[PDB]
C-alpha cells in the first residue's frame, strides 16, 4: 500500500543517536567499500544507508586516488542503516557519481547519474530496474541531491542541477510515478545557485534546504507543491549555515538573496518547525570540522538569530562533511507526524591526511521530544592505513 507523507513535521526539541556504522574503523581489516555521500532514506518497513563507492575497498590499492568525484566505476549501493557499507550486505542500486533514492510505500526509486561530464544521463530505477532516463539538458554535469528524495502519496520529487558549479547554473524539479517521469519544472533563480538539496515532506509540501556554491553562505530554500508550483529563495534566518562562511556577528540574513562574499560550500540541511528552524552546520566556519544543530526562533520566516536550542553532534576537533535530511514514515515511528531525522558524513583521508584514499563514515540522529546532551560521535579511525 502507498505511503502517505502528507503529515507535517513533529515539532522536535533535541536529537538522539539513531545509528553509526564505523565503516572506516572496520575497513582497516574487513572488506568495506571506499565510499562517499552516505545518505539515509526509509520505507514503510526499513531505513537504508545509500552510498557511492569508488568501485574499490578500503586498504586496497584501488582506493588510490578516490578523491576524484566522478568515475565510471562509481556505483550507488545500499545497506540497512547503522550497518557499514560493506560488500556482503550491500545491494546494488545503480551506477552513479551523483544520486538520490526514496520509497513510494511500495518500491524504492533510485536515481543514478553517470556518464561523461558533457552529457550525463540520469537513470531512474524503480524497484531495482532502470525505468526512465534523463539526459543532461545543459551539458554541464547533470547531478542530484546526494540525499533522500521525497514521495508524497505515491509520487516522488527531487532537484537536479546542470551548468557550472562556480556561478549561475540551472535547476529543475522532477516528478515520477512508479519510476515514470510524468512531470518536470524549471526553477528560475537568476543570481542564485541551488546544489544538492536536503528535502523532506512537510504540511503536504516538500521543503528543501540547499547549497549555494556561488556566492551564498546562506542556503537556498524551496517549497514544492505536487503541481510543481514552487517558492524558491533563501533561509530567512540571519545565521549562515554554510562552509566556508563568515562570523555570526557580522552577517545579514535574507529570504530572497544570497549573502556573504564566499565561494564554495557543502551540503547541509534545515527543518521548518512552524515558524522556527532546525539547521545543521560544521562547527568550524572555514573547515569541514565538527558539527552541531541550532534552533532559531522564527528563523524560518524572518532574519533573526534567536537561538532557542543548540546541540553538538561532532566536536570541532574532528572531521565532518556532508549532512542531509530524511524522515521516519508514519508506518514506523508510530508518531502522528513525520519525525525529522538527519545524517552527517564524516570524511577522512585526502586531501588532509596521509592517505592515497578518500572515504567517509556516518552518524545519524533523530528528532525526539526532549533535549539531548552534547557529545562527539567522531569517525574514530586511525590513519594512515598499511597501504600508505
Amino acid at each position: 500500500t502507498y505511503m502517505n507523507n502528507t503529515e507535517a513535521i513533529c515539532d522536535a526539541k533535541g536529537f538522539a543517536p539513531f545509528s553509526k556504522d564505523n565503516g572506516i574503523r572496520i575497513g582497516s581489516r574487513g572488506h568495506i567499500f571506499v565510499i562517499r555521500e552516505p545518505f539515509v532514506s526509509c520505507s514503510p518497513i526499513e531505513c537504508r544507508t545509500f552510498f557511492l563507492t569508488q568501485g574499490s575497498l578500503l586498504n586496497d590499492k584501488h582506493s588510490n586516488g578516490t578523491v576524484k568525484d566522478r568515475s565510471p566505476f562509481r556505483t550507488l549501493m545500499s545497506v540497512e542503516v547503522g550497518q557499514s557499507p560493506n560488500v556482503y550486505q550491500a545491494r546494488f542500486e545503480a551506477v552513479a557519481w551523483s544520486a538520490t533514492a526514496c520509497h513510494d510505500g511500495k518500491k524504492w526509486m533510485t536515481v543514478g547519474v553517470t556518464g561523461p561530464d558533457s552529457k550525463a544521463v540520469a537513470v531512474i530505477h524503480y524497484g531495482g530496474v532502470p525505468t526512465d532516463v534523463v539526459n543532461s539538458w545543459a551539458g554541464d554535469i547533470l547531478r542530484t541531491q546526494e540525499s533522500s528524495c521525497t514521495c508524497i502519496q505515491g509520487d516522488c520529487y527531487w532537484v537536479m542541477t546542470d551548468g557550472p558549479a562556480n556561478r549561475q547554473a540551472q535547476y529543475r524539479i522532477y516528478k515520477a510515478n512508479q519510476g515514470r517521469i510524468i512531470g518536470q519544472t524549471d526553477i528560475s533563480f537568476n543570481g542564485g545557485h541551488i546544489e544538492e538539496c536536503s528535502c523532506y515532506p512537510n504540511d503536504g509540501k516538500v521543503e528543501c534546504v540547499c547549497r549555494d556554491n556561488w556566492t551564498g553562505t546562506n542556503r537556498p530554500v524551496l517549497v514544492i507543491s505536487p503541481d510543481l508550483s514552487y517558492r524558491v529563495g533563501y533561509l530567512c534566518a540571519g545565521i549562515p549555515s554554510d562552509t566556508p562562511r563568515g562570523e555570526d556577528t557580522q552577517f545579514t540574513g535574507s529570504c530572497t538573496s544570497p549573502m556573504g562574499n564566499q565561494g564554495y560550500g557543502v551540503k547541509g540541511f534545515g527543518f521548518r518547525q512552524g515558524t522556527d528552524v532546525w539547521m545543521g552546520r560544521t562547527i568550524s566556519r572555514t573547515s569541514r570540522s565538527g558539527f552541531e544543530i541550532l534552533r532559531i526562533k522564527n528563523g524560518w520566516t524572518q532574519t533573526s538569530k534567536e537561538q532557542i536550542r543548540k546541540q553538538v553532534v561532532v566536536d570541532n576537533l574532528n572531521w565532518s562533511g556532508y549532512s542531509g535530511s530524511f524522515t521516519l514514515p508514519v508506518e514506523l515511528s508510530g508518531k502522528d507526524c513525520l519525525v525529522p531525522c538527519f545524517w552527517v558524513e564524516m570524511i577522512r583521508g585526502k586531501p588532509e591526511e596521509k592517505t592515497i584514499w578518500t572515504s567517509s563514515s556516518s552518524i545519524v540522529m533523530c528528532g525526539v521530544d526532549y533535549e539531548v546532551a552534547d557529545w562527539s560521535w567522531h569517525d574514530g579511525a586511525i590513519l594512515p592505513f598499511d597501504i600508505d
Copy 2:
C-alpha cells in the same frame, strides 16, 4: 500477534548446550567484531545474540585498548544465536555502551545508552527506529541490564542504574508499549546497590537477580508487577553467587541485607523454581574463571545452602565473565511454560593476557527435564594474535 510471557517457569533439572559461537577463535582470521556483553533474547520466531562492539574487529589495530568500557564508537548489534558476532551477519540495533533488548511478540525493542558520562541518554528503539529517549536523571553514567529485558503481554520492562558504582546509587524501573515510555518507578534500596539485572518472566511477574557492586557478595533481587509495585531485597540463599566473594563455609545469607565485606562484583543470574533457586557463578571466588550452576533447596525464600543439583559449564582453568538470563517463549519450545535458559560471557585478553585488546565469546545453555553431565565449553582461542 502479541506474545504472552504469562506462564511460570518450567521447573528444570539440568542445563543442556544451546549454542556456541567461537567468535574469538574465528576472529583470528575472519572479520569478527571485538565485542562484550553478548546477551541472548528470543522472539516468537528467533533467538538472537545481542552485543556491544568497540567499533573494531579482532586482530586489527583498532581493537587496541578495547578494555575501555565506554566509547562513542560503541554499538549494539545482533546476530542469530550460535552465530559469531561477525560483520556480514550483524544487524545494527543502536549506538550503545550499555544496553538491553527484547521482543513484545510483534517487534524488537532495544535500548542503547550512549553519551558523556555526565548526562547519558538512553535511546529506545522499537522495530529498529528510535522511538523514545531517557536522559540521565542523576548525571552519573545512566546504564542498563546488559541482558534481556522482559515483555509480559505486549508491555516491556527493565532496570536502569545511575549514580556511582562503588557506593549508593539510584535504581529505576521503566515500562513501555511499542517503544513508548508509559511508566517508570523508583526503586528505594538505601544501603543497597542494584547493577545489571538478569530478568525473566515468572508467574506473571518479572523476577530479577542483580549485582551489588558496593558491599554485597549476595545478589540484589526484585519482583515486578505490571503496575510497578515491587519487592526488592536479596537472594535468600546463604550461598554468595557474586565475584569476588567469600567461602561458602563462612557466609550468612539474607533476604533483606547485603552480606560480606567485599566491593566489586560481576553480572549474574538466578531462577526461582517454586521455592528453590538455580543460581550461576564463576568457580573461582576471586577471579572470573570457570562457571557452574547450583540448585538450592528452598534457596529462594530461605537462607539455606542445600545443594540438590550442581553442574559445571566451564572449568576453573578457563576464563568466564558475565552470565545472564532469558527464556524461550511458548511459541518456540512447545513447552507449557517458559523454559529457563542462560548464557555465559567468556572474556579473553586484557588485562590478564598478552593483548592490546579485550573481547569475549559465549556459551548458551537451556533448562531441560533431566540432569546433564558436567564439562567445559571454554573460549578456546590462542593468544596473543599477530597484532601483538
Copy 3:
C-alpha cells in the same frame, strides 16, 4: 503465477546503464570468485547475474591457470545483478563449465553441463534441484548458450551444440516444463555453425543471434515457435558483428549463408526491432577490445548497413569479451512490452596481461526510449595482483 513473455520488444532508441559489479577491482582485497560467462536473467521479481567460477577466488594461488575453459571445479552460481560475484552473496546453481538459466514465472530453471569432453551430461535444475539430464548426443563437448534461456508462458527453450568447434557440428533446441524435458528438435544447418545463442522472447517467438565459430563473421540467427518449427540462417545486415571480422567497407551480407573467410569468433547479441536490428560487437575487429551497439535500418530482413543509431559502451582502449541478451519481464519494467537489455563481459588477465589468472567483470545496459551519450564503463582493475 506463470510469467507471460508473449509480448514483442519495446522498440528502443538508446541504452542506459543498469548495473556494474567492479568484481575484479573489488577482488584485489575482497573474496571474489574468479569467474567467466557472467550472464543476466530476470524473474517476475529479481534480476540475477549467473556465472561460472573456477572454484577459486581472485588473488589466490588457486586462480592460477584459470584460462582453462573446462574443469571439474567449475560451478554455475548467481548473485543479484550489479552485485559482484562474491562468495557470501552467491547461490550455488549447478556444477557447470557451460550453462544457461531462466525463470518460468514460478521458479528458476538452470542448466549446468559438466563431465568429460567425450560424454558431457547437462543437468537441468528446476527450483534448485536436479530434475532432468541430457547426455552428449555426439560425444564432442555438449555445451549451451552462456546466456539467458527463454520462457514463453511457462515453457522454457534453449540451444545446445555438440561436435567440434572449428567446423561442422550439431545444433539442437530443447524444451521443458518445470525442469522436465518434454521436447527437442534438430537444427539442420549444413555449412553453418551455431555457438552460444543470445535469445529473447519477441512477438511470441524466441529469436536468437549466435556465433559462427567456423567461417562466419556474420551471426547465425534462428526463430523458434513453441512447437519447435524453426527458421535458421544469418543476420541479414551486411555488417559483420563477430570478432575477428573484416572491415565494414569490404563485406557482403546474407540471410542464408556465412560470409567472410575468418575462423574463430565470440559470443554476441542482436535485437529485432520490427524490421531494424540492434547489434552489439567489439570495437576492435581483430581483438576483444571495446564495445558499441548499432542500429541498422532494415538490418533484420535485408543486407544493408544503414546506421540509424550507434553507441559506445566500452572504448577501444579497454578489454571486453562476451556480450549477451535478456529481457525485463512485464511484471518489472511496467512497460507494455519486453524491454531489450544486454550485458558485456569484460575479460582481464591471461593471455594478454601479467597474471596467472583469467576472470571477467560486467556492465549491463537497458533499452530506453531515448538516445544515450557514449562512454566507457571499463573493468578498471589494476594488474598484476600480488600473486604474480
Copy 4:
C-alpha cells in the same frame, strides 16, 4: 504442512552431479570453516549442507590439530547445498562432535551430541531451539549418523551408538514429534556392530545401510517401521562396500552375519531398488581414495555380485572419505517417488598430507532416469597452505 515421505524410491539408472562447494579450494583465501561430516538434507523448500566445524577457519592457526574428532569447540552448522561451509552464510544448528538433521515438513530437527566421552548428551533441536535431551545410556561416546535422519509423515527417526568402537557396542533407534522424544527401541545385534547409518524413506519404512567397525567389511542393514519393529542384518550382496575390505573375488556375502576379517571402516550408503541395490564405496580397497557407485542385480535380497551398473564419481588418484544418503522430497523433484541422492566427503590434509589441519569438501549426486558418464569431481585444493 507436514511432509509425506511415504513413497517408495524412484528406481534410478544413473547419478548426475547436484552440487560441489570447493570449500577447501576457496578456503585458501576466503573465510571457510575447517569442517568434517558435511551431510545433506532437504525440506519441502530447500536442500542444506550440514557440517561439523572445529571452531576454526582454514589457513588459520586454530585449524591446527583438527584431526581430533571430539572437541568442545565443535559445532553443527548448515548452509544451502552447493554453497561452501563459509562463516557468513552459515546458520548455527547446535554444538556437536556427532550429529544428524532432517525436516518434518514444518521445521528442522537437528541432533547435536557433545560432552565428555563418558557421559555425552544428545541435544535435540526442533526449529532451532533445544527441545529434548538424550544422555549416554552406556557411557561410551554417545553418537549418531553423521547423515540425514528420516521423517515419515511428521515423525522423525534415527540411529545412535554407544559403547566401544572396536568390538560389541549398543544400538538404539529414537523417534520424535516436533523435537519430542516419544519413542525409542533397542537394536539387538550380538556379534554385530552398527555405526553411522545412512537412512532414507522407502515404501513407508526407513531403510538404513551402516558401518560395521568391528569385523564387517559388509554393511549392517536395518529397516524400521513407525512402531519401532525392525529387521537388522547385513546387505545381502556378496560385494564388500566397506573400507578397508578384501577383494571382490575372494568374499562371501551374508544377510545375517559380518564377513571378512577386517577391523575399521568408513561411513557408506546403499539404496534398495525393489530387489536390486545401489551401493557406494571408495575405489581403493585399503585407502580412502576414489569413489564409485554400483548396481547389483538382486543384491538387496540375495548374495550375488551381478553388476548391472557401475559409475565412478571420484578417481582412485584422489581423496574421498565419508558418503551418505538423503532424498528429494515430493514437494521438490516433482517426481512421484523419493529421488535417491547421496553425497561424498572428500577429506584432505592430516594424516596423509603436509598440514597441521584436517578438513573436507563435498560432491553431491542425484538419481536420474538415465546412465551418466564416469568422471572425477575431486576436491582440487593445493596443499600445503601458507600456515605450514
